[PDB]
């Protein structure tokens, strides 16, 4: 019998692996300072739920930017810094990408190349593609054979990039390889970028998380600022505050003069208004309170160090069991790598042994999260790995 | 010597939105009689923001559960929230829920639900990447409808007749004519109830006429539902038009906001409800929704959704919330009734029953822009040049002043 066809009839179906921090117990961890501030918030009868400003909670935006840039930053003294509270680091990247696609290098120029690292966090392509960018390029970064950063490959890709190209840079704790340039390598990178007018779009999702120290982990950003770059920095508080599901992020903008900031933020407002309208309050409030209070801030830093040290511990104990197991290959990359994630150096095959032969679950890329290791399994994975590297 | 120019040197300063200018001025006003009818959120009789008692109760509960963690929610949101929200709009006994052809996507308020649904439509509706499909919005409408559909890529945004300045009412004939003349598969953004900004809604009988032309011409209903319960005090009646379309066999989208009816403005709690002809299409549609969310906000925040989900799934808290909701609706009905009564006592020229025929916190008063200027400049009564007022700016204490002032504006300025 007759009947109308659905307007969705032809919609097609879209087509150690843990991605967050876990204790040695293998549980999620609400940071102690976060639990403390949540209690304070719940018992402050004087807070309401009225809409935040479109650009977000003022105190959060100021605090977030100062964290990346440092209290003593020249750009903050000179008032040429702005911040846009966003929906996690993803939202910050998306808002920045939408801005650049409309107002950077010409008006509505979707032709500017965008360079991402090879490999990189996968949603990078997705966000910039969705903002309209036609030409997404990757730069050389991971040296599979030396199992480390291909500096010559990266610098060459920088040299051959058209002027005004946008580079997405990981501030620290590169995702997914765990391999970061040293400060001296950063200086060489900055060098080419300044010469060819390349725009730095920093992605900062692990500040503090990666080395245990917030100051250290923000150095590259601050270095670019001190060298007089204009730049965007997408900040996530998902990991270093453990507030994954409250979607707390900040887009920091650094300009050459204070006037530009006002105009840039005015256009930002328009883009936010038609995306989420204004941002949610709960996570931002927790971050702002923590960062504004010297004693909470001090506690927080201790909590972040705790996470960072546990990862360093699985890192030094893993390379060591591996080494001491006289397992074939160099493994100083496992300790030289920084952050939650490590590119093991295994091949897809080896990984097959891992998931199929001894039930170790990790990506085809060879990526593991160090937070899935415990004192209770460290031993076991170490031989399954010495295992695979061998059969 | 020379320092090369900012890459931002040519970015223009955007132009501001009037309402912000209006709020500013209001605060910069020293006259103790000043009145803000331009506010955009609920206010009590002593002009304060109101946190719902059930929300404060649930927040405490949440603070005191140690079992809760902050791990990422699924991309499409908290499952219990998505179900409860969709059931609230459609009703527990909805044929669509029983037949499993309903889907829910947690969103960043009603704005985010509209944005995600617009993005979907611009990629997969009426062909592939078809951005030419006309999108129709009411005349006038909530200022952000245009921007959201424009940014999703739609190029042909049109208006349907709606508000009739002469009748101070619904132009049903013009609406019906614009429906009749719309190209097949055009998308219509419809206000479920409490039309923003006019407060004028079709009656049930009128909705039936609207639905019959959309059915015939395969016009797509994209409902915007920001005031369920808040509107009438009655959750069922306020969902009537949505449910009627479902019962008539329509496929549709429904952008739900919990900002107003839960007073959770700043926790950005929204839901996109999807109703399809077949169960299997919901799976495919949500798979595409996931990809769109992924590159926008990645996954949604937890706090507001946890609050709504707990309230709606617990009989004692649900009953309490319906009482809080009724309180808000009742204050608004009372200001409407009190204002019209005063205008009529003063023998104010013209008809004023639109004041009580309208629904929700917003009202198109019919005042002209010259009468609006008078109220701001001479009376310290702040409202938009359209004549839009928020009924919540009215209180038992300023009512006489406002009625009297409008009466002055109407009689001395023609």
Author numbering:
A (entry chain B): -1 to 13, 35 to 410
B (entry chain A): -1 to 412
Quote the passages of the study that discuss this structure, keeping the authors' original sentences.
Here we report the neutron crystal structure of a PLP-dependent enzyme, aspartate aminotransferase (AAT), a fold-type I PLP-dependent enzyme that reversibly converts l-aspartate and α-ketoglutarate to oxaloacetate and l-glutamate via a ping−pong bi−bi mechanism. Pyridoxal 5′-phosphate (PLP), the biologically active cofactor derived from pyridoxine, is one of the most ubiquitous cofactors found in nature, catalyzing ~140 different types of biochemical transformations. Recombinant porcine cytosolic AAT fortuitously packs as a biological and crystallographic homodimer, with the two active sites having different activities toward the substrate analog α-methylaspartic acid. In AAT, the protonated pyridine nitrogen of the PLP (N1-PLP) enhances charge delocalization through resonance, permitting the subsequent transamination reaction.
To probe the structural changes that occur upon internal aldimine SB protonation, we obtained a low-pH X-ray structure of AAT in the absence of substrate, in which both chains are in the internal aldimine state. At pH 4.0, the internal aldimine shows geometric differences near the SB of PLP compared to the neutron structure at pH 7.5. When the geometries of the internal aldimines (chain B) from the pH 7.5 and pH 4.0 structures were compared, two major differences were evident. The torsion angle between the SB C = N bond and the pyridinium ring, and the O…O distance between the Y225 hydroxyl and O3′ of PLP are different. In the pH 4.0 structure, the SB is 22° above the pyridinium ring plane, compared to 46° in the internal aldimine at pH 7.5. Additionally, in the pH 4.0 structure the O…O distance between the Y225 hydroxyl and O3′ of PLP is 2.9 Å, compared with 2.6 Å in the internal aldimine state at pH 7.5. Protonation of the SB nitrogen of the internal aldimine at low pH appears to introduce an H bond between O3′ and the SB by reducing the torsion angle between SB and the pyridinium ring. However, protonation of O3′ cannot be ruled out as H atoms were not observed in the low pH X-ray structure. Forced protonation alters the PLP alignment, suggesting that the microenvironment involving Y225 and the phenolic oxygen (O3′) of PLP influence the SB protonation and reactivity.
